[PDB]
Amino acid sequence: SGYTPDEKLRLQQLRELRRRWLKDQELSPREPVLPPRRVT
Amino acid sequence: HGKRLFIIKPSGFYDRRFLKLMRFYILLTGIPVAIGITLVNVFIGEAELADIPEGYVPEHWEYFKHPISR
């Protein structure tokens, strides 16, 4: 039983890519660049 | 904690723009209409019922009560 070597390797590569993608989802401290303008 | 993440969602620009445009045009014509109705009600309208004086034949628009309807 267990993973075949190809399945193992594909899983590691896919999870490295997924962790990179998830890390790229964070926002920088300036990311929500909000434009200001008004008119008891 | 600086764990702020990006929320994936469809664009709200076009729906918001349509709602703003529709509200703008509806209000553009309806605010003067409401103001005019209020002024007519306060300063002019609400005729009172009276008997027809003898020998006088009223006009067709004199049988109605509200000034706008008249």
Rounded Cα–Cα distance for residues B5 and A20 (Å): 14
- Resolution in angstroms, to 1 decimal, for this deposition? 2.7
Q: Give the whole-angstrom CA distance, residue B22 versus residue B33.
A: 17
Angle, CA of B32, B33 and B36, to the nearest 5°? 80
Q: Any chain B CB within 8 A of the CB of A25?
A: yes
Pick from B67, B70, B65: nearest CA to B42: B67
Counted across chains A and B, CB pairs separated by less than 8 A come out at 12
* DSSP bridge pairs for A26: B5
**Following DSSP, what letter does each residue of B1-67 receive, concatenated?**
----B-------HHHHHHHHHHHHHHHHHHHHHHHHHHHHHHHT------PPPTT----GGGG--ST
Residues 3-32 of B with CB under 8 A from A: 3-6
Long-range CB pairs of A12-18, under 8 A, 24+ apart, other chains included: none
Quickly tell me which residue has 């109605």 as its tokens: B64
Q: Which residues of A touch B4 (CB under 8 A)?
A: 26-27, 31
Å from B2 to nearest chain A CA?
8
Solved with: cryo-EM
